[PDB]
């Protein structure tokens, strides 16, 4: 046995490209559609629970994700893929970050763990790039809220608004005409849910639809009174209910 | 580096005519207290070799399941198992030999004193020492403990050098190892009544007797004893 | 053309060798089933003794993973008893390390995190099998969770894995369209188990004897498989209404 | 601590006290002593609590290792067990411990590894510091194939003894009964054992 | 022998109104005989301030150690690191050799440029955190600062009453210890401005 | 340090003085020894006072990456089986003696582990040097069926046996209170019976009393821009 | 194309081309069976006297493992003495830690586990071997037969190696006639007569039969070797039966 | 080995190092220089246990050499320092410590400044304007305090060093054979060789 | 085995080449340009972002320039992800320095190391290379004001002036039209953003385009500042030097 695979499965093809790389971002075109988008006072993350069967009760399947108290993760392609580096994004914040300074990291420092994991997958022997493209949201005290793409190849951008999947290219310029930087958090998950119809097809509801929102510390979840610095985590998954109440006002 | 813990007294054997005989009581002490009182420190290796073992009882075991995986391993791919290709005294002997040098020397050693006795192919007689040391040596009579300070004096009359071998029998030989487990028995302050025997001869085998005990004691000479001057 | 021999991107994006380890799953042409009741979690899976000089109490694709879970797989024997083996392992070490019994979705979610693995590195192929994990957790209730070659894995109400895995759902999924409730509404496992195995013999279109088929039953703090005569005493009272 | 098992005519009875001390000091005057490992197989703890406490854990996860793949283990393999981890790290282990269990095949049986990690199978056992004080009692007083009132009486008198002498020992009487109609725990308090 | 006071020396820390102190004195021995009068004790990083008490070698090492980190911190945050912050740090770095310590009492002193508040922490040689809201004290002649820190300490000082108290302390606790003294420097420490203070003091 | 468990009706509760001393000398004197390995899992650490802040950090830190792994809420079994073999393998060099207490989905529990890696169940525990203080008054006062209101009087008296009595315990005592279907309360400094009192004198000096060498402004700011 | 150049590679139908090619060199061997009777198990083998100067009776080829069980082979012979050594180290490492023998089903896992993992990678081959073994433990009597895919399952007869066809039809001519059971002195004068007839498929070179039995009332649930009377009573009844 | 000593004056450095090696009972040489130049301006006295101080000396030494040659440039006095205090902090922590104590006498030619700096096997370093490691500085800095000056020509610095010796000379136990005395300065290294 | 699928990612060609190498320094050149040039009174680097969007977030952005330490920073002409590790190895390195000798890395120093770790990937190991050209900007007391290149064979050189990725050819040449020894930063600063304005393959040059630095000692006496330009005052020395 042993790894014998020490060398790069990526490499650089006579054009300059690098082939899995690329092929890594033709399966994040094919996955479903996500999205984000900063207001001044959160930002908001969504996407469609596509259930693979009826049967199959698809609130099990988390596409969006808790990172730390106030970072939360959405992504589009392979669903696995994702949730192992959502494990892998969890642990990271914590053994290179809250054991060293005794806080959560910023945003972007996460962002850039999980970047170098992905990079990593580029570049190391006997492995092939992950097969997604996440969008990170976050708060911080210092950086107040930010967005983050972060690809295959380990590149990451931030943003004021974004898709990737499958209709990107129609929802980023849906999110074009419709940001500004005026926004607050409900004219968002507004934007957001009008966004996310059009790459919809079937049923569009609280059920069918995966919405999270990095906003106002949340005193209610922390789970335990007596520590006045300590008033709660700003990420909040959005309930069914929520999701449906917003939509006739839609 | 460790202690021995709950032990064995001693073994003792010696060689006759036609092949050899060992003993070794039925205690296992916990210091001074008399805890397990059926414990087998005989234990016989195929129809040829019983292996005595004193000192560590949890050593005794792990080192009766090294010769029982011995006796395993030999008859693998081995047509002629029970024939000729059978584990010898002196194979047996030499394996532990080995094992109880190399841990002696790794500083972990098996806390025993064993005496290896049985009859070769050839039909000649195979008594040998080794202990946690690893020290080695053969004789006439081989005695552990106490037994070499007190079976051993008593033994060697009966067998005193090579050439008194054949001329010991079998009965002999048995009546001075059974005389000298009783006088273990009144000087030993860890020895049990109750003890094993194994004859293992040329001609007749491997004889192996169990709950053997010692008999026709002197103390009637206590009852005139009084005071202590 | 390397792309389909390893576990790395086709042009499309694709993985082939998950591809085909998904068609290796159906090479035993057997069909399982699994539903949950109120109390409990039974799984049903076809049995196929071709050879008469088979023993035939040797042959199962149901494995006892601990006390609480019991898994069903699809695919071939050896990379089953590979992931009956490994689940048995991790079921032991998490109740060691935690101090409470690994729940049947976390042991789903690490067997899939595993197979996950084998679709990234390149030097471990995919095991060619479908997993079906049931308990009834102490938190959950009746569980059924499947994992697969991709990694994949999600909760059910009730599912179907096989050849003929399709008419199994349909009809499992036209049941609880009427009833519309997440469950079977019984009181007891024997008649779920009896409600499955009518449910797969109305899809399959097949009649069932007591050797053709083998059960799994799930419930607070154990699971079990039935015997023979267990699964008689099913078959009989299902023919008698 | 003051700890015995004794098999008899349905099966086995493992017996505790359950005083803790940390000098003269009682740290715990209601501790468990009599732990699982599997479902008929259980053992009386002696030495180092935390020795015993990590043993016992690392046979639990064994046996049920060992069930899921091979079904229900023998008490001599849970014996074997106890044993592999006590032998080979007796430079570092101060445990003393009873193994008892309950097979339909075999039924009651008692196995005692003392601190160097020997094993001894007996019909009963005694260990522990309180243990000392009784060798006498129990040997005059113990008889084969009891019944089980007889010998929920024979180590309620020992422990009794045991307590009254050794002052490492005290608190309640625990004892769990293992025979093929289940699992039956037994509890004994000052005031009824110390008139005895 | 005992690591901690083969080289000898003080720090105190103390809070005032919008303000924090830090002081130490300047002392290097080897055991009896004094090596160094210039040896200053306290660092900063940004507007963070770190006395270090204890083995000079170990002072010496940490201080390039938070140097080496906080640079880092720096690079990768875009912003300088608050008090808050690096005192886990201390704390994690400490720990990190719980069974082969840096002999060592750190003190960490500062102003949360964000909240604005005034903060000290002092620490074990293994890293626990001790956040008094007062004062903290480490060296060789602690138990003196302690003694005098009780007495004379006062909340709500003003920067400029905060330096009498402090320098006292410091001065009159040195003079009781045979390895402390030779010169003593007080940092007062505000928001935006940090005033460093040599005292004149006894040279034996 | 005393601290003590207390187990009542729908939950548990624990307590601990605020006292930390370095051998006679108190370093801190309202120190905080209510620790959170997680929202509803809460232990209070006697002993080596680094040594039960971070093996705390490190189990909570692990047990909250464990709730995210398993989509559960934390039980103290979990948090238990993980402090003892951490501290058993480090065969007490480790100085962590801990009581851990928590509410859980399995209910409410209390235990005790101490630095070599054993544990204990129990209605009432006490660790630290005040504990024997501790123990005196919840052997004479603890009964089953306690009410909240009675666990936390029980909770803190034994806490101030050993803030009188033992001289490693002092000033003021510190409750949590975990009760089932709840946020865990936290109650820092819940009794204050050391104030100081007011001094004689004020010490205050007069500015320019001390003699100063020289003065110089600190450059804390980056290196400026033109 | 191409799928079949590299162990552990699915083909476009799910197959791993490298362990059917090792069945080849499995069907290539010679004939080996094992009959499970009443209270035990036999095992025998076609043993090819490729010359005269092959020393009769000496290159044995059935192996035991432990002392309990036994096992036989057809195909690559150093394979099959490779998974042997493995069982060996299975079986040493179960008792040393467990104290009782290996049960049959216990250690017929080990083995396939063993060879299942010779199947996950390139970088190792298949074993080119079907192994038929068994022997009593605690439950009774057990009879199982692995292929190079690390697939196994319990037998009440079975076959394999070039002559596995004609075994078969024997094998279950057995399981029909005799639905109460067969016992060990009979299923060992089966097993020769079963070699006897499926040595028809190597009919070119004359053979050598080799039996070995494990039986509870016969050989104290113990290995051995059949020798001497016993073993020409058998190859007499054989031998009666082929004419 | 026994007495180093050191002095920085004006525009120069001077280090003071005795001759004898005594091995228990005997003294086996009466001329040894307990000295290596790292750089053209880096001169690096040493003293502590047997065999370790020569090892230490050289592999400094060594080190000192290579990154000369690699940068084409000599590293300053205080770089080097740095870069001998971390070996010795490194040092202390390992399975056997070398037990060296060293004087670093440098001029930097970039600053035009003389530079003394002292550090012990603990990796303690202090930059002094005049030091000593052991005993030494027990019979000599009572003379230094009162007589030295920051603006000394090299030649005072000398005499006031003769003095040291002197005392030392008088009131020691040991019979040091005397010292090894060279200055540092901006032409680089000499040995005065009467002394 | 596994031999099958080994591309040798550290092979000569016939012609000598390192293919990897070669095929990297392509992916490059397709990269946005980056150029740095050095004045007497400090460094200028200018660098053009990759065709963006408007709903990028620019203020809280780099992708370009990146700070090494507080005397040295780098230019990035590539694969931002490679970079990124490269630039944090380069950081640990300038602070392992400080560390040792109590003093700031040498820049040069500094960029022999990293181009020793690029060199490492294609001569051992089995691994592809870094897609990555750096120009770094340092100044320290030894050399002053200092500009470098380093690509993925390892190889590093020293420049006056100089651009990375996409266009160098054209870049250069109108470099090396204009470029005078005794130029000025304020006058280096207008030649980098004429030099992307013309060799840009973009229709024009705006602010959200750019990434801009200066390193001056132009920081109060005897010391040195770096100068991240933030979108606004690239907006500002857009207009200043006429180009929108
Ligand atoms: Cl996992
Ligand atoms: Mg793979
Ligand atoms: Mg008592
Ligand atoms: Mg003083």
Not at chain 5, 75 to 96: G, M
Not at chain 6, 174 to 201: F, H, S, W
Not at chain 7, 118 to 129: A, E, K
Not at chain 7, 167 to 191: C, I, M, N, W
Request: charged share 25%; hydrophobic share 35%.
């Amino acid at each position: 046995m042993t790894d014998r695979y020490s060398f790069s499965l990526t490499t650089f093809s006579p054009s300059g490209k690098l082939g899995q790389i690329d092929y890594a971002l033709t399966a994040v075109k094919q996955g479903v559609t996500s999205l984000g988008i900063k207001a001044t006072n959160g930002v908001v993350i969504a996407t469609e629970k596509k259930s693979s069967s009826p049967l199959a009760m698809s609130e099990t399947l988390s596409k969006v994700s808790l990172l730390t108290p106030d970072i939360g993760a959405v992504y589009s392609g392979m669903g696995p893929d994702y949730r192992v580096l959502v494990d892998k994004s969890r642990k990271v914040a914590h053994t290179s970050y809250k054991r060293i300074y005794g806080e959560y990291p910023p945003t972007k420092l996460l962002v850039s763990e999980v970047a170098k994991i992905m990079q990593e997958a580029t570049q190391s022997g006997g492995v092939r790039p992950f097969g997604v493209s996440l969008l990170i949201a976050g708060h911080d005290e210092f950086n107040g809220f930010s967005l983050y793409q972060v690809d295959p190849s380990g590149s990451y951008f931030p943003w004021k608004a974004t898709a990737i999947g499958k209709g990107s290219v129609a929802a980023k310029t849906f999110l074009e005409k419709r940001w500004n930087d005026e926004l607050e958090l409900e004219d968002a998950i507004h934007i957001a849910l009008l966004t996310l119809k059009e790459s919809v097809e079937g049923e569009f509801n609280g059920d069918t639809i995966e919405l999270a929102i990095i906003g106002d510390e949340n005193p209610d979840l922390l789970g335990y009174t007596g520590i006045p610095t300590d008033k709660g985590p700003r990420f909040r998954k959005l309930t069914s209910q929520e999701i449906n109440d917003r939509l006739e006002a839609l | 580096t460790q202690q021995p813990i709950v032990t064995g007294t001693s073994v003792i054997s010696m060689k006759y005519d036609n092949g050899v005989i060992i003993a070794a009581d039925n205690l296992g002490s916990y210091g001074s207290l008399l805890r397990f009182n059926g414990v087998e420190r005989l234990i016989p290796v195929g129809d040829n070799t019983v292996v005595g073992i004193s000192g560590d009882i949890s050593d005794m075991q792990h080192i009766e399941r090294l010769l029982k995986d011995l006796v395993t391993e030999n008859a693998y791919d081995n047509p002629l198992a029970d024939a000729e290709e059978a584990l010898e005294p002196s194979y047996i002997f030499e394996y532990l030999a080995t094992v109880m040098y190399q841990r002696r020397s790794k500083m972990n050693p098996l806390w025993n004193a064993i005496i290896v006795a049985g009859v070769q192919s050839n039909g000649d007689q195979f008594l040998r020492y080794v202990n946690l040391l690893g020290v080695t040596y053969s004789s006439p009579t081989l005695a552990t403990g106490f037994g070499a300070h007190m079976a051993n004096p008593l033994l060697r009359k009966v067998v005193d050098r090579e050439s008194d071998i054949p001329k010991t029998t079998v009965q002999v030989a048995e009546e001075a190892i059974v005389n000298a487990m009783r006088v273990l028995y009144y000087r030993d302050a860890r020895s049990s009544r109750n003890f094993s025997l194994a004859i293992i001869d040329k001609n007749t085998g491997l004889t192996f007797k169990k709950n053997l005990q010692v008999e026709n004691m002197k103390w009637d000479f206590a009852k005139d004893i009084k005071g202590y001057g | 053309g390397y792309d389909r021999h390893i576990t790395i991107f086709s042009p499309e994006g694709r993985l082939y060798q998950v591809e085909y380890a998904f068609k290796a799953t159906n090479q035993t042409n057997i069909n399982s089933l699994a539903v949950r009741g109120k109390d409990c979690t039974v799984v049903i899976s076809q049995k196929k003794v071709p050879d008469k000089l088979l023993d035939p109490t040797t042959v199962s694709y149901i494995f006892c993973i601990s006390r609480t879970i019991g898994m069903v797989v699809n695919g071939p024997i050896p990379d089953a008893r590979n992931a009956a083996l490994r689940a048995k392992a991790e079921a032991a070490e998490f109740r060691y390390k935690y101090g409470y019994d690994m729940p049947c979705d976390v042991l789903a979610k690490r067997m899939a995190n595993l197979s996950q693995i084998y679709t990234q590195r390149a030097y471990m192929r995919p095991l060619g099998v479908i997993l079906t994990f049931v308990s009834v957790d102490e938190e959950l209730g009746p569980s059924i969770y499947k994992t697969d070659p991709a990694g994949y894995y999600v909760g059910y109400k009730a599912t179907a894995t096989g050849p003929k895995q399709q008419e199994i759902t349909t009809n499992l999924e036209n049941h609880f369209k009427k009833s519309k409730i997440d469950h079977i509404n019984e009181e007891s496992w024997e008649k779920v188990v009896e409600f499955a195995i009518t449910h797969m013999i109305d899809a399959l279109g097949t009649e069932f004897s007591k050797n053709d088929l083998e059960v799994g039953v799930a419930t607070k703090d154990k699971f079990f498989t039935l015997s023979a005569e267990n699964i008689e005493e099913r078959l009989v009272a299902i023919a008698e209404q | 601590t003051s700890i015995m098992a004794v098999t008899f005519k349905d099966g086995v009875i493992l017996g505790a006290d359950s005083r803790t001390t940390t000098g003269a000091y009682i740290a715990n005057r209601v501790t468990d002593k009599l732990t699982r490992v599997h479902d008929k197989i259980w053992c009386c703890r002696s030495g180092s609590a935390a020795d015993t406490q990590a043993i016992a854990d690392i046979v639990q996860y064994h046996l049920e290792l060992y069930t899921s793949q091979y079904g229900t283990p023998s008490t001599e393999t849970a014996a074997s067990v106890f044993k592999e981890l006590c032998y080979e790290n007796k430079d570092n282990l101060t445990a003393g411990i009873i193994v008892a269990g309950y097979d339909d095949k075999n039924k009651g049986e008692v196995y005692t590894i003392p601190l160097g990690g020997s094993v001894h199978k007996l019909p009963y056992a005694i260990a522990g510091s309180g243990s000392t004080f009784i060798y006498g009692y129990c040997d005059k007083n113990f008889r084969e194939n009891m019944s089980k009132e007889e010998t929920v009486d024979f180590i309620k008198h020992s422990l009794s003894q045991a307590i009254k002498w050794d002052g490492s020992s005290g608190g309640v009487i625990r004892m769990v009964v293992l025979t093929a109609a289940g699992v039956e725990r037994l509890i004994f308090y000052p005031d009824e054992y110390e008139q005895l | 022998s005992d690591p901690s006071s083969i080289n000898g020396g003080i720090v105190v820390a103390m809070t005032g109104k919008d303000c924090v102190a830090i002081a130490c004195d300047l002392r290097l021995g080897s055991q009896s005989l004094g090596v160094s009068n210039k040896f200053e004790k306290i660092f900063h990083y940004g507007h963070v301030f770190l006395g270090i008490t204890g083995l000079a070698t170990d002072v010496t090492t940490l201080n390039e150690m938070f140097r080496y980190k906080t640079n880092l911190y720096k690079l990768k945050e875009e912003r300088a690191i608050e008090p808050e912050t690096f005192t886990q740090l201390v704390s994690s770095s400490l720990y990190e050799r719980r069974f082969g310590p840096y002999f060592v009492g750190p003190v960490v002193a500062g102003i949360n440029s964000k909240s604005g508040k005034p903060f000290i922490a002092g620490f074990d040689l293994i890293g626990c955190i001790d956040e008094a809201k007062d004062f903290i004290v480490s060296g060789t002649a602690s138990d003196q600062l302690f003694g005098m820190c009780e007495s004379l300490y006062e909340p709500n000082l003003e920067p400029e009453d905060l330096f009498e108290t402090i320098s006292q302390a410091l001065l009159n606790a040195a003079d009781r210890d045979a390895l402390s003294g030779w010169g003593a420097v007080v940092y007062i420490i505000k928001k935006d401005e940090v005033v460093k203070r040599y005292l004149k003091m006894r040279q034996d | 340090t005393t601290i003590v468990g207390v187990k009542f009706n729908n939950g548990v509760v624990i307590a601990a003085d605020t006292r930390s001393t370095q051998g006679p000398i108190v370093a801190d004197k309202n120190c905080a020894k209510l620790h959170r390995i997680s929202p509803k899992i809460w232990c209070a650490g006697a002993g080596t006072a680094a040594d039960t802040e971070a093996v705390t950090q490190l189990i909570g830190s692990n047990i909250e990456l464990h709730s995210l792994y398993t989509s559960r809420e934390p039980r103290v079994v979990s948090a238990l089986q993980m402090l003892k073999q951490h501290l058993f393998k480090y065969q007490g060099h480790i100085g962590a003696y801990l009581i851990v207490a928590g509410v859980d989905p399995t209910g409410s529990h209390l235990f005790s582990i101490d630095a070599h890696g054993s544990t204990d169940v129990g209605y009432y525990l006490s660790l630290g040097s005040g504990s024997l203080a501790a123990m005196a008054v919840l052997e004479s006062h603890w009964k089953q069926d306690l009410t909240k209101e009675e666990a936390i009087k029980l909770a803190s008296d034994a806490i101030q046996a050993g803030i009188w009595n033992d001289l490693g315990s002092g000033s003021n005592v510190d409750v949590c209170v975990m009760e089932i279907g709840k946020d865990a309360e936290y109650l820092r400094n819940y009794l204050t019976p050391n104030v100081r009192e007011e001094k004689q004198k004020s010490y205050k000096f007069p500015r320019g009393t001390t003699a100063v060498l020289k003065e110089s402004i600190v450059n804390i700011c980056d290196i400026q821009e033109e | 194309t191409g799928y079949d150049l590299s162990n552990s590679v699915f083909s476009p139908d799910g197959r791993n081309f490298q362990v059917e090619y090792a069945v080849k060199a499995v069907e290539n061997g010679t004939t080996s069976i094992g009959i499970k009777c009443n209270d035990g198990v036999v095992f025998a083998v076609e043993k090819l006297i490729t010359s005269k100067l092959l020393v009769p009776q000496k290159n044995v080829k059935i192996q035991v493992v432990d002392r309990h069980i036994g096992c036989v082979y057809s195909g690559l012979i150093p394979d099959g003495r490779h998974l042997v050594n493995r069982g060996r180290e299975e079986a040493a490492s179960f008792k040393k830690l467990y104290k009782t023998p290996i049960p049959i089903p216990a250690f017929a896992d080990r083995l396939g586990q063993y060879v299942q993992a010779h199947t996950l990678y390139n970088s190792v081959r298949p074993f080119g071997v079907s192994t038929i073994f068994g022997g009593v433990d605690k439950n009774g009597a057990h009879l199982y037969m692995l292929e190079p895919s690390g697939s196994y399952w319990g037998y009440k007869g079975a076959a394999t190696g070039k002559g596995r066809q004609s075994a078969k039809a024997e094998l279950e001519k057995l399981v029909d006639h005799h639905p109460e059971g067969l016992s060990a002195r009979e299923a060992v004068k089966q097993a020769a007569k079963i070699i006897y007839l499926a040595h028809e498929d190597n009919k070119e070179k004359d053979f050598e039969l080799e039996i070995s039995w494990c039986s509870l009332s016969e050989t104290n649930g113990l290995h051995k070797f059949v020798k001497g009377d016993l073993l020409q009573e058998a190859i007499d009844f054989a031998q009666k039966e082929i004419n | 080995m026994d007495i180093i000593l050191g002095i920085r004056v004006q525009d120069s450095v001077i280090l003071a190092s005795s001759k004898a090696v005594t091995r228990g009972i005997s003294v086996l040489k009466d001329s040894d220089d307990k000295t290596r130049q790292l750089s053209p301006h880096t001169l690096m006295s040493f003293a502590g246990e047997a065999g370790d101080t020569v090892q230490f000396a050289e592999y400094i030494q060594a080190n000192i050499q290579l990154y000369s040659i690699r940068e084409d440039y000599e590293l300053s006095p205080q770089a080097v320092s740095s870069f001998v205090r971390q070996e010795l902090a490194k040092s202390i922590r390992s399975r056997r410590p070398y037990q060296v104590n060293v004087l670093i006498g440098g001029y930097d030619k970039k600053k035009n400044k003389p530079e003394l700096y002292q550090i012990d096997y603990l990796g303690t370093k202090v930059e002094l304007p005049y030091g000593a490691h052991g005993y030494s500085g027990f019979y000599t800095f009572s003379l230094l305090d009162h007589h030295y000056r920051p603006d000394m020509t090299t030649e005072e610095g000398l005499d006031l060093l003769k003095l040291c010796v002197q005392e030392l000379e008088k009131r020691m136990p040991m019979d040091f054979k005397g010292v090894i005395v060279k200055i540092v300065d901006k032409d680089g290294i000499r040995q005065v060789d009467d002394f | 085995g596994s031999r099958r699928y080994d591309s040798r990612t550290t092979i000569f060609s016939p012609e000598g080449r390192l293919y990897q190498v070669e095929y990297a320094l392509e992916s490059i050149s397709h990269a946005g340009t980056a150029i740095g040039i050095m004045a007497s009174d400090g460094i200028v680097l200018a660098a053009e972002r990759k065709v963006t969007s408007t709903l990028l977030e620019q203020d809280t952005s780099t992708e370009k320039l990146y700070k090494l330490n507080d005397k040295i920073a780098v230019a990035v002409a590539g694969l931002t992800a490679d970079a990124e590790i490269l630039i944090n190895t380069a950081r640990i390195h300038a602070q392992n320095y400080l560390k040792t000798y109590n003093e700031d890395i040498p820049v040069e120093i500094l960029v022999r190391r990293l181009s020793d770790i690029k060199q490492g990937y294609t001569q051992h190991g089995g691994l592809r290379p870094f897609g990555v050209s750096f120009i770094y900007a340092g100044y320290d007391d030894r050399y002053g004001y200092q500009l470098y290149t380093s690509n993925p064979s390892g190889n590093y050189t020293g420049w006056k002036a100089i651009s990375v990725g996409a266009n160098t050819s054209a870049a250069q040449t109108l470099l090396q039209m204009d470029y005078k020894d005794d130029m000025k930063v304020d006058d280096a600063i207008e030649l980098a953003l004429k030099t992307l304005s013309k060799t840009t393959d973009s229709s024009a040059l705006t602010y959200d385009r750019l990434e801009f630095a200066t390193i001056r000692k132009g920081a109060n006496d005897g010391e040195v500042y770096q100068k991240i330009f933030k979108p606004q005052e690239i907006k500002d020395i857009l207009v200043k030097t006429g180009i929108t």
